[PDB]
Amino acid sequence: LSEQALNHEKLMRAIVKNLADTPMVLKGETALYLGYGLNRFSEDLDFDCHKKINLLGRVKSAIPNGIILNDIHIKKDTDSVGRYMVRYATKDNKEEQTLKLEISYRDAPKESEVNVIEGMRIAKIERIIDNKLCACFDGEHTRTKARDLFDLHFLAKHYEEHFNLDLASRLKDFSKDPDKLVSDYLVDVKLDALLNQIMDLEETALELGVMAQLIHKKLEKLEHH
């Protein structure tokens, strides 16, 4: 964890802690990082929220000591989506940084589906798995991002109990051809600063395929406790 990263994290945590008394629910990669022990750094803030709030006002108030807020650019503010570029600097370094902040106002989790971890409102693992699989495999607009392989492996390894039959079946299907995964993701892994040092693509792909196969097989037994 470099100084740039540590400060970035300082900024993210301050924003999410501030939003704890609103309906904002943290999701995605940084939910995993801040909430569930993800073993890579994450940089974006992604939220679901059932209604509009004074987002700008909250971000401004939330800037903690040691951070300089240069600007907030409103990329998109509609009924269904909020998309912002928060530009900032630091007491340790003057070079401008960016934080992407994105909110979805559709299909917000109901209050009974919201976890609180160290004072932060965060989505359940199940929803995060579902969203990742939509994002990398079977959603409306899939993408090829190595982060998704890294994160699904993490989830399959450390949170297998949160997989149900549907989630496991899709995971198994996503990861059935490990050589294709390695082929599909290789360039992205090399170009990703967050992954290129820490990730063995060949091993990750292989282990995911094996873990998914086993998780799904277990759930197919329809066992009870």
mmCIF file of C-alpha atoms in Angstrom:
data_model
loop_
_atom_site.group_PDB
_atom_site.id
_atom_site.type_symbol
_atom_site.label_atom_id
_atom_site.label_comp_id
_atom_site.label_asym_id
_atom_site.label_seq_id
_atom_site.Cartn_x
_atom_site.Cartn_y
_atom_site.Cartn_z
ATOM 1 C CA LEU A 1 0.000 0.000 0.000
ATOM 2 C CA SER A 2 1.708 3.113 -1.361
ATOM 3 C CA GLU A 3 1.059 6.653 -0.111
ATOM 4 C CA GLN A 4 -1.097 7.387 -3.123
ATOM 5 C CA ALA A 5 -3.215 4.350 -2.346
ATOM 6 C CA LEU A 6 -3.457 4.901 1.364
ATOM 7 C CA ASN A 7 -4.719 8.421 0.812
ATOM 8 C CA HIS A 8 -7.152 7.178 -1.820
ATOM 9 C CA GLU A 9 -8.437 4.684 0.684
ATOM 10 C CA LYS A 10 -8.673 7.437 3.305
ATOM 11 C CA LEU A 11 -10.900 9.379 0.905
ATOM 12 C CA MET A 12 -13.116 6.364 -0.038
ATOM 13 C CA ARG A 13 -13.730 5.321 3.598
ATOM 14 C CA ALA A 14 -14.634 8.899 4.608
ATOM 15 C CA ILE A 15 -17.194 9.142 1.818
ATOM 16 C CA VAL A 16 -18.778 5.715 2.588
ATOM 17 C CA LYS A 17 -18.843 6.415 6.378
ATOM 18 C CA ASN A 18 -20.610 9.731 5.706
ATOM 19 C CA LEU A 19 -23.306 8.019 3.677
ATOM 20 C CA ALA A 20 -24.122 5.556 6.441
ATOM 21 C CA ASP A 21 -27.261 7.481 7.491
ATOM 22 C CA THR A 22 -28.599 7.637 3.931
ATOM 23 C CA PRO A 23 -30.060 4.760 1.867
ATOM 24 C CA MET A 24 -26.784 4.451 -0.179
ATOM 25 C CA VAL A 25 -25.555 0.828 -0.315
ATOM 26 C CA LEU A 26 -21.900 0.128 -1.396
ATOM 27 C CA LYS A 27 -21.490 -2.665 -3.954
ATOM 28 C CA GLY A 28 -18.969 -4.051 -6.343
ATOM 29 C CA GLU A 29 -15.253 -4.291 -6.043
ATOM 30 C CA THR A 30 -14.745 -1.733 -3.323
ATOM 31 C CA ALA A 31 -17.547 -3.329 -1.246
ATOM 32 C CA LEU A 32 -15.346 -6.437 -1.336
ATOM 33 C CA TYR A 33 -12.237 -4.418 -0.455
ATOM 34 C CA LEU A 34 -13.760 -2.360 2.370
ATOM 35 C CA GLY A 35 -16.160 -4.970 3.634
ATOM 36 C CA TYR A 36 -14.985 -8.492 2.933
ATOM 37 C CA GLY A 37 -11.195 -8.548 2.905
ATOM 38 C CA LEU A 38 -10.453 -8.466 -0.860
ATOM 39 C CA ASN A 39 -6.693 -9.040 -1.306
ATOM 40 C CA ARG A 40 -6.140 -6.463 -4.047
ATOM 41 C CA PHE A 41 -6.618 -2.694 -4.049
ATOM 42 C CA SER A 42 -9.825 -1.211 -5.533
ATOM 43 C CA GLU A 43 -10.371 2.398 -6.630
ATOM 44 C CA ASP A 44 -13.996 3.101 -7.659
ATOM 45 C CA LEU A 45 -17.083 3.771 -5.529
ATOM 46 C CA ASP A 46 -20.262 2.059 -6.779
ATOM 47 C CA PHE A 47 -23.613 2.326 -4.964
ATOM 48 C CA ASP A 48 -27.275 1.347 -5.198
ATOM 49 C CA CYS A 49 -29.803 3.817 -3.735
ATOM 50 C CA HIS A 50 -33.619 3.858 -3.792
ATOM 51 C CA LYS A 51 -33.957 7.632 -4.054
ATOM 52 C CA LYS A 52 -32.034 10.799 -4.892
ATOM 53 C CA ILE A 53 -30.113 12.434 -2.031
ATOM 54 C CA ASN A 54 -27.867 15.483 -1.707
ATOM 55 C CA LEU A 55 -24.841 13.499 -2.994
ATOM 56 C CA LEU A 56 -22.631 16.531 -3.835
ATOM 57 C CA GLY A 57 -23.276 18.092 -0.443
ATOM 58 C CA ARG A 58 -22.336 14.809 1.262
ATOM 59 C CA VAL A 59 -19.090 14.299 -0.724
ATOM 60 C CA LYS A 60 -17.948 17.876 0.005
ATOM 61 C CA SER A 61 -18.626 17.479 3.758
ATOM 62 C CA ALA A 62 -16.904 14.077 3.727
ATOM 63 C CA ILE A 63 -13.463 15.142 2.458
ATOM 64 C CA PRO A 64 -11.196 14.220 5.378
ATOM 65 C CA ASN A 65 -8.055 16.003 6.636
ATOM 66 C CA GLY A 66 -5.031 15.508 4.378
ATOM 67 C CA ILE A 67 -7.124 15.500 1.198
ATOM 68 C CA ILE A 68 -7.575 18.438 -1.169
ATOM 69 C CA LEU A 69 -10.838 18.503 -3.166
ATOM 70 C CA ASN A 70 -10.121 20.153 -6.513
ATOM 71 C CA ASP A 71 -13.394 19.401 -8.293
ATOM 72 C CA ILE A 72 -16.480 17.221 -8.855
ATOM 73 C CA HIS A 73 -17.508 16.726 -12.480
ATOM 74 C CA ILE A 74 -21.040 15.543 -13.035
ATOM 75 C CA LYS A 75 -20.772 13.100 -15.910
ATOM 76 C CA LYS A 76 -24.409 11.913 -15.568
ATOM 77 C CA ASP A 77 -27.284 12.820 -13.317
ATOM 78 C CA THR A 78 -30.577 11.264 -14.379
ATOM 79 C CA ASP A 79 -33.543 9.450 -12.792
ATOM 80 C CA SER A 80 -31.765 6.101 -13.058
ATOM 81 C CA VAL A 81 -28.022 6.926 -12.739
ATOM 82 C CA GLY A 82 -25.443 9.135 -11.012
ATOM 83 C CA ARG A 83 -21.931 9.271 -12.393
ATOM 84 C CA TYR A 84 -19.254 11.634 -10.968
ATOM 85 C CA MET A 85 -15.521 12.287 -11.308
ATOM 86 C CA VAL A 86 -14.117 13.499 -8.024
ATOM 87 C CA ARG A 87 -10.682 15.105 -8.617
ATOM 88 C CA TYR A 88 -8.451 15.582 -5.621
ATOM 89 C CA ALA A 89 -4.953 16.059 -4.330
ATOM 90 C CA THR A 90 -3.132 15.265 -1.131
ATOM 91 C CA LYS A 91 -0.999 16.875 1.626
ATOM 92 C CA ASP A 92 1.819 14.508 0.535
ATOM 93 C CA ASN A 93 1.507 14.992 -3.233
ATOM 94 C CA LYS A 94 0.120 17.729 -5.465
ATOM 95 C CA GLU A 95 -0.545 15.643 -8.576
ATOM 96 C CA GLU A 96 -4.313 15.480 -9.197
ATOM 97 C CA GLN A 97 -5.981 12.102 -8.609
ATOM 98 C CA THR A 98 -9.439 10.847 -9.640
ATOM 99 C CA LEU A 99 -12.141 8.912 -7.875
ATOM 100 C CA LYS A 100 -15.052 7.608 -9.911
ATOM 101 C CA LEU A 101 -18.285 7.526 -8.084
ATOM 102 C CA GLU A 102 -21.341 5.847 -9.561
ATOM 103 C CA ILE A 103 -24.864 5.324 -8.226
ATOM 104 C CA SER A 104 -27.768 3.237 -9.562
ATOM 105 C CA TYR A 105 -31.283 4.307 -8.561
ATOM 106 C CA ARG A 106 -32.978 1.176 -9.954
ATOM 107 C CA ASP A 107 -33.427 -2.208 -8.153
ATOM 108 C CA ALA A 108 -31.950 -0.895 -4.880
ATOM 109 C CA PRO A 109 -31.589 -3.556 -2.174
ATOM 110 C CA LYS A 110 -34.390 -3.588 0.387
ATOM 111 C CA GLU A 111 -33.260 -2.645 3.918
ATOM 112 C CA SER A 112 -33.362 -6.299 5.027
ATOM 113 C CA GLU A 113 -30.713 -7.072 2.348
ATOM 114 C CA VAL A 114 -28.186 -4.468 3.661
ATOM 115 C CA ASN A 115 -25.154 -5.405 5.760
ATOM 116 C CA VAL A 116 -23.292 -2.950 8.026
ATOM 117 C CA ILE A 117 -19.530 -3.519 8.352
ATOM 118 C CA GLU A 118 -17.457 -1.081 10.446
ATOM 119 C CA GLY A 119 -20.217 1.528 10.125
ATOM 120 C CA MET A 120 -20.561 1.195 6.336
ATOM 121 C CA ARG A 121 -23.735 0.196 4.486
ATOM 122 C CA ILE A 122 -22.683 -2.574 2.095
ATOM 123 C CA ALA A 123 -24.366 -5.152 -0.179
ATOM 124 C CA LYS A 124 -24.506 -8.865 0.671
ATOM 125 C CA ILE A 125 -21.995 -11.215 -0.945
ATOM 126 C CA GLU A 126 -24.794 -12.916 -2.958
ATOM 127 C CA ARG A 127 -25.682 -9.672 -4.727
ATOM 128 C CA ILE A 128 -21.998 -8.927 -5.408
ATOM 129 C CA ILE A 129 -21.544 -12.417 -6.954
ATOM 130 C CA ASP A 130 -24.657 -11.938 -9.075
ATOM 131 C CA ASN A 131 -23.462 -8.521 -10.327
ATOM 132 C CA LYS A 132 -19.958 -9.839 -11.151
ATOM 133 C CA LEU A 133 -21.349 -12.707 -13.151
ATOM 134 C CA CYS A 134 -23.667 -10.321 -15.031
ATOM 135 C CA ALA A 135 -20.635 -8.094 -15.637
ATOM 136 C CA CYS A 136 -18.220 -10.768 -16.978
ATOM 137 C CA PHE A 137 -20.419 -13.539 -18.318
ATOM 138 C CA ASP A 138 -24.188 -13.373 -18.793
ATOM 139 C CA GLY A 139 -25.459 -9.787 -18.398
ATOM 140 C CA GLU A 140 -26.659 -7.350 -21.063
ATOM 141 C CA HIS A 141 -23.247 -5.789 -21.588
ATOM 142 C CA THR A 142 -20.427 -8.055 -20.640
ATOM 143 C CA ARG A 143 -16.847 -6.859 -20.441
ATOM 144 C CA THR A 144 -13.478 -8.457 -20.461
ATOM 145 C CA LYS A 145 -11.797 -7.326 -17.327
ATOM 146 C CA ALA A 146 -9.330 -9.436 -15.413
ATOM 147 C CA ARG A 147 -10.471 -7.958 -12.151
ATOM 148 C CA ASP A 148 -13.603 -10.059 -12.522
ATOM 149 C CA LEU A 149 -11.657 -13.280 -12.703
ATOM 150 C CA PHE A 150 -9.522 -12.246 -9.731
ATOM 151 C CA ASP A 151 -12.590 -11.326 -7.672
ATOM 152 C CA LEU A 152 -14.718 -14.377 -8.518
ATOM 153 C CA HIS A 153 -11.770 -16.625 -7.614
ATOM 154 C CA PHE A 154 -11.489 -14.756 -4.319
ATOM 155 C CA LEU A 155 -15.226 -15.253 -3.738
ATOM 156 C CA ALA A 156 -15.172 -18.956 -4.740
ATOM 157 C CA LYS A 157 -12.230 -19.532 -2.398
ATOM 158 C CA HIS A 158 -13.345 -17.590 0.653
ATOM 159 C CA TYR A 159 -17.122 -17.266 0.443
ATOM 160 C CA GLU A 160 -18.310 -20.483 -1.172
ATOM 161 C CA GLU A 161 -21.158 -20.774 1.347
ATOM 162 C CA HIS A 162 -22.818 -17.719 -0.253
ATOM 163 C CA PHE A 163 -23.164 -19.446 -3.561
ATOM 164 C CA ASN A 164 -26.566 -20.920 -4.321
ATOM 165 C CA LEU A 165 -27.407 -23.332 -7.168
ATOM 166 C CA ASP A 166 -28.041 -20.586 -9.726
ATOM 167 C CA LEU A 167 -24.867 -18.617 -8.853
ATOM 168 C CA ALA A 168 -22.713 -21.769 -8.737
ATOM 169 C CA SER A 169 -24.096 -23.095 -12.015
ATOM 170 C CA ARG A 170 -23.269 -19.849 -13.802
ATOM 171 C CA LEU A 171 -19.801 -19.672 -12.137
ATOM 172 C CA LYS A 172 -19.062 -23.226 -13.290
ATOM 173 C CA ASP A 173 -20.207 -22.265 -16.811
ATOM 174 C CA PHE A 174 -18.128 -19.051 -16.870
ATOM 175 C CA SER A 175 -15.043 -20.990 -15.750
ATOM 176 C CA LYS A 176 -15.438 -24.294 -17.630
ATOM 177 C CA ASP A 177 -12.693 -23.594 -20.204
ATOM 178 C CA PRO A 178 -9.605 -22.376 -18.213
ATOM 179 C CA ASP A 179 -7.385 -22.092 -21.293
ATOM 180 C CA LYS A 180 -9.941 -19.785 -22.904
ATOM 181 C CA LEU A 181 -9.999 -17.676 -19.697
ATOM 182 C CA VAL A 182 -6.244 -17.306 -19.810
ATOM 183 C CA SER A 183 -6.440 -16.400 -23.488
ATOM 184 C CA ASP A 184 -9.247 -13.946 -22.994
ATOM 185 C CA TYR A 185 -7.686 -12.142 -20.123
ATOM 186 C CA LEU A 186 -4.003 -12.140 -20.770
ATOM 187 C CA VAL A 187 -3.591 -8.712 -22.215
ATOM 188 C CA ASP A 188 -5.783 -7.136 -19.624
ATOM 189 C CA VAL A 189 -3.889 -8.692 -16.802
ATOM 190 C CA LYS A 190 -0.571 -7.443 -18.100
ATOM 191 C CA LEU A 191 -1.910 -3.936 -18.543
ATOM 192 C CA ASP A 192 -3.578 -3.784 -15.141
ATOM 193 C CA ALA A 193 -1.443 -2.193 -12.503
ATOM 194 C CA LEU A 194 -3.707 -3.546 -9.797
ATOM 195 C CA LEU A 195 -3.253 -7.117 -11.015
ATOM 196 C CA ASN A 196 -0.025 -7.458 -12.973
ATOM 197 C CA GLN A 197 2.224 -7.845 -9.928
ATOM 198 C CA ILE A 198 -0.031 -10.097 -7.828
ATOM 199 C CA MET A 199 -1.976 -12.306 -10.230
ATOM 200 C CA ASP A 200 -1.004 -15.635 -11.810
ATOM 201 C CA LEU A 201 -3.619 -15.872 -14.561
ATOM 202 C CA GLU A 202 -2.981 -19.549 -15.436
ATOM 203 C CA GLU A 203 -3.241 -20.685 -11.797
ATOM 204 C CA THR A 204 -6.283 -18.434 -11.019
ATOM 205 C CA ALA A 205 -8.201 -19.728 -14.063
ATOM 206 C CA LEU A 206 -7.407 -23.331 -13.180
ATOM 207 C CA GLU A 207 -8.304 -23.002 -9.489
ATOM 208 C CA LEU A 208 -11.554 -21.137 -10.265
ATOM 209 C CA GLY A 209 -12.648 -23.902 -12.667
ATOM 210 C CA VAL A 210 -11.972 -26.576 -10.047
ATOM 211 C CA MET A 211 -13.563 -24.692 -7.159
ATOM 212 C CA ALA A 212 -16.703 -23.881 -9.178
ATOM 213 C CA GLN A 213 -17.099 -27.466 -10.311
ATOM 214 C CA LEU A 214 -16.959 -28.608 -6.659
ATOM 215 C CA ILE A 215 -19.265 -25.895 -5.265
ATOM 216 C CA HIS A 216 -21.953 -26.695 -7.841
ATOM 217 C CA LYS A 217 -21.651 -30.454 -7.378
ATOM 218 C CA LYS A 218 -22.217 -30.036 -3.641
ATOM 219 C CA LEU A 219 -25.355 -27.896 -4.088
ATOM 220 C CA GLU A 220 -26.748 -30.383 -6.600
ATOM 221 C CA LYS A 221 -26.919 -32.960 -3.787
ATOM 222 C CA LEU A 222 -29.721 -30.843 -2.229
ATOM 223 C CA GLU A 223 -28.469 -31.453 1.324
ATOM 224 C CA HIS A 224 -30.059 -29.935 4.488
ATOM 225 C CA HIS A 225 -28.874 -28.756 7.899
#
